[PDB]
Amino acid sequence: LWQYWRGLSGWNFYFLVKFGLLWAGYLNFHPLLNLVFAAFLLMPLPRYSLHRLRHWIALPIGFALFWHDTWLPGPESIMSQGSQVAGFSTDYLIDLVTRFINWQMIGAIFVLLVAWLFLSQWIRITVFVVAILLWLNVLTLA
Amino acid sequence: RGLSGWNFYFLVKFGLLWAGYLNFHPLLNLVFAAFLLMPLPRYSLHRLRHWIALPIGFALFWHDTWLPGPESIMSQGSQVAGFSTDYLIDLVTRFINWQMIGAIFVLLVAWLFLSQWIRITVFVVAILLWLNVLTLA
Amino acid sequence: SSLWQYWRGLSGWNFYFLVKFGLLWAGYLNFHPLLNLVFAAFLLMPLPRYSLHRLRHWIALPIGFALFWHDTWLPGPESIMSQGSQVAGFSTDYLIDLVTRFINWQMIGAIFVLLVAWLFLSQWIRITVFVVAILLWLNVLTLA
Amino acid sequence: MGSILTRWLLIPPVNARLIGRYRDYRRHGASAFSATLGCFWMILAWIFIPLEHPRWQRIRAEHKNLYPHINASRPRPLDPVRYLIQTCWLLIGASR
């Protein structure tokens, strides 16, 4: 089964971003759910097809989980209030978007991406991600 | 050949014990563990043991849980047959702590990963022995 | 195809950052640590294709300039355009005098010395490691 | 560290690999203490460093050239520090 354990690949970056956001105070982090998700991603699958399937399944799940961890209104609230947003002029929407998007945060995420690309070659980032996840869970239980 | 898949069984029990969901009977579980560790030379005896152990393990786990005895369910089961499918689903969702399920899953993955490096049986037996000592002290 | 053959040091941009650090130290620059880091990250990003590298340099030049201008207290291009019509009325002699007053020959000489130092040191040491370390350090100081 | 303890704690393939290596270190004149520590560090390196990656393969292949002062077959307790220092040197003033 040793040969079938494949590190969190691109999902390492997903978690790093989450950690960064948690640290910045933008995320309500649910430690156990994220650990379960990580466990799901680390689970040893022998077949290449199962790996593809996992990636496909993991993408929506990861997104959902990320959203859940965010302070963002549920898709239901957006759908019910979305009809009010459709009446906003394009200029207002752009203004809202520019105010909402912190270009500094985007830049940080980018820097993190480059760092991750660079570090993933030297160090097993998965080990750290899992360690931090374990640690965060322990903190929530203590 | 070590406690193979039964290591996970005990780990789950330990986890539940720690969470307060299980009344752990240390002696019965030790005996069960001893039964599982007994060296059998033949591959067939190993299969038999697994078959026997499955009902015993389940019985023991149930016994260790706060769940109503099969007798109580059978006697009250006729009252549950009248419940609408929606109520049953609601009851089931309320009863199942999705967090616990997730924890068990995580434990499983951890166990699969660690079992490749370390003999988990040694730890399980050590904890069992320790828990028995605590109950006698 | 290990993305690795494609990691190239900050080459000439090392000098750009050194100059910035020197100016920051002299108190002439309001250094925005995160933006400069992002820029550095952009420059370090691994690109497999030679064409993408050329493109990066082309893009990086205006960005680097813009960022350098931003980090300086210099009036925004808008202020210059709106007040520029007032500067067009200045006699060539005045403009030269203003320029001579504005340009500190000592600072130009320092930049030149820094350039020579960099060319010389770059032969022995990887300056990129230092530039990135200082950038990271400056960012940490702003967060502490 | 043929110690009954490793036989009890580690699975047979892992134990066999560790013992093989340990013995290899002993054959090349490493003290028991140094050999154990070497095995420990290796394990740590495997855990944190993707030794399967083409980069680490190249570095391992050129180990004798890059780290002439460190004998891979005779580990010394301060070998990690030596690796760090040398690596720092290679990273900084080492261009020719």
* Overall size of chain D counted in residues: 96
**Given A1, A5, A39, which is nearest B106 (Cβ)?**
A39
CA angle B43, B46, B49 (to 5 degrees): 160
Q: Which of A20, A17, D92 is nearest to C139 (CA)?
A: A20
DSSP string for chain C: --GGGG----TTHHHHHHHHHHHHHHT-----HHHHHHHHHHHHS---SHHHHHHHHHHHHHHHHHHHHHHS-PPPHHHHHHHHHHHTTS-HHHHHHHHHHH--HHHHHHHHHHHHHHHHHTTTB-HHHHHHHHHHHHHHHHH-
Instruction: Give the Cα separation of D47 and D45 in Å (integer).
Output: 5
Instruction: Give the Cα separation of C78 and C82 in Å (integer).
Output: 6
Look up residue C4 and give its two tokens: 């690795």
Look up residue C82 and give its two tokens: 């709106």
Chain A residues touching C138 at Cβ < 8 A: none
Q: B62 φ, ψ to 5°? A: -60, -45
Instruction: Give the Cα separation of A14 and A64 in Å (integer).
Output: 13
Instruction: Give the Cα separation of C18 and C128 in Å (integer).
Output: 10
Would you tell me the crossing angle of helices B43-64 and B26-37 to the nearest 10 degrees? 170
- Indicate the resolution in Å: 4.0
CA angle C21, C26, C30 (to 5 degrees): 65
Look up residue A45 and give its two tokens: 């699958």
Mutate to test the interface with C, among A111, A113, A116, A117 (most CBs of C within 10 A): A111
Q: Report how far Cα A6 is from the mean position of its chain's Cα atoms.
A: 19
State how far the alpha carbon of A23 is from the alpha carbons of A139, B67, D89, in Å: 14, 42, 34
**Given A1, A32, A40, which is nearest B103 (Cβ)?**
A32
> What end-to-end distance do the CA atoms of chain B give, in Å?
32
Taking a C-beta distance cutoff of 8 angstroms, is the pair B119, D10 a contact? Answer: yes
Per-residue three-class SS string for A61-96 = HHHHHHHHHECCCCHHHHHHHHHHHCCCCHHHHHHH
B113 to chain A, any CB pair closer than 8 A? The answer is yes
Residue A108 CB neighbours (<10 A):
20
Widest distance between CA atoms in chain D: 51
